[PDB]
A paper describes a structure:
Ab326, Ab354, and [name] belong to the Class II type antibody that binds from the upper side of RBD. Ab159, Ab326, Ab354, and [name] exhibited similar or better neutralizing ability against Wuhan pseudovirus than the therapeutic antibody. Hamsters were infected with the Wuhan strain on day 0 and were intraperitoneally treated with 50 mg/kg BW of an N297A-modified antibody (Ab326, Ab354, or [name]) or control human IgG1 on day 1. We mixed equal amounts of Ab326, Ab354, and [name], and administrated a total of 20 mg/animal (5-7 mg/kg) the day after infection with a Wuhan strain. Indeed, the live virus in the control IgG1 group became less than detectable range by day 5-7; however, those in all of the animals treated with the mixture of the neutralizing antibodies became undetectable by day 3, earlier than the control group. Live virus was partially detected in the lungs of the control group even at day 7 whereas it was undetectable in the treatment group.
Numbering used by the authors:
A (entry chain H): 1 to 120
B (entry chain L): 1 to 107
C (entry chain A): 330 to 529
Write the structure that this text describes.
Amino acid sequence: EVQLVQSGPEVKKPGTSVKVSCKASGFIFTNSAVQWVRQARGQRLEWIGWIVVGSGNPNYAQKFQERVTITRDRSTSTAYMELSSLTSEDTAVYYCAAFPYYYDNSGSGPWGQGTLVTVC
Amino acid sequence: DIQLTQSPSSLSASVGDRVTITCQASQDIRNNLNWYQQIPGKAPKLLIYDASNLETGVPSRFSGSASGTDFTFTISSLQPEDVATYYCQQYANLPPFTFGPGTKVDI
Amino acid sequence: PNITNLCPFGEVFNATRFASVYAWNRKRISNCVADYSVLYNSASFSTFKCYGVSPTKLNDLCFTNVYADSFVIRGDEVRQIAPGQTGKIADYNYKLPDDFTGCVIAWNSNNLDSKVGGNYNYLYRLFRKSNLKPFERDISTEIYQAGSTPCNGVEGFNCYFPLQSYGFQPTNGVGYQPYRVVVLSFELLHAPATVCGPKK
Ligand SMILES: *[C@@H]1O[C@H](CO)[C@@H](O[C@@H]2O[C@H](CO)[C@@H](O)[C@H](O)[C@H]2NC(C)=O)[C@H](O)[C@H]1NC(C)=O
């Protein structure tokens, strides 16, 4: 019952922001945390974003700050993702993870199907 | 900032061997360290969380162990079909969850 | 005797916006006559409990000070607003003394506080270094220190934001539904009593 899915936008506009939506179900949402990672061709995986459902502090790594934004979304259980200054090597799979038991020192929660955000 | 490294980076074995994946972090995370699976064509999922604390739906052959900052991911029943790429994942009280270089286990 | 200034109890029950639990109001109702009979004699009040005084006798024995406080809390723990009872919100956000002296009133308000999409406005605390002394606010947006690693401000797995939202929905179970709770505490300071009953 606990799982999540994502949208599938591909190319909004080179040099302009894109919108990615993730939805989840099966677990109480306003207790957990969600996060975003990048997977580029070549099996190289890096972390980009992370937001807690509690209050909201869009904290990111030093590399990608002032260039990304994740918005809390209590429609039913969702989050939206955006990032500006699209370049030639932003094409990647944007993977969603969710720690359900954030308030416990444990990790769980399936991952979405991945959004193929490419550039053209 | 935190950083880590996964030394094996490649395996070549067929059956039986207690294949191990050893990765070491710059900081001695207490227990907030896990591991991730990734099929060459599917999305990554979870195998072991909280340093080898198994999760609902895990297979038997998957396990792990700890020794100080060094952390081992063990398959005691390696089989020719459980072929994919692995990652050891870190997170300890700070936002940057840098990822290891992974490993593609192969026959 | 006739009648004089009647206490503005409506302005504490019939208001429009109620403060969240972690930071509750404190109206210093004083020098007015309060008719508790009309309060009690009504079916709109779900829970009507009192301690130290029976609910049908307080209309006499003029008091010194009456403190009215308000919360909106999940129904299925309303009971734990009573003295002594332990739990989660009571032991961190509001705990009455074991020698408490006052009345707890609570009623369902599914028609106002809930929203079609869910009114996630009210907030409650989740962590604290230690328990809470009686009758004191805890307004603080400082990350709670879990484990032993210091929290410099960045949210983390041992750096938890103290507050979180109820997440109300006007289709949930009866327990999950909101309830407006009013605590009427009484204090007898050595001074002329100033809040008497209707007939007196
Ligand atoms: C608070 O609001 C309620 C909402 O009805 C008021 O209840 C009415 O009060 C008047 C005045 O006594 C009565 O004539 C009505 O019959 C009451 N209606 C209901 C449905 O009870 C109440 O009086 C207001 N003031 C308080 C509670 O102090």
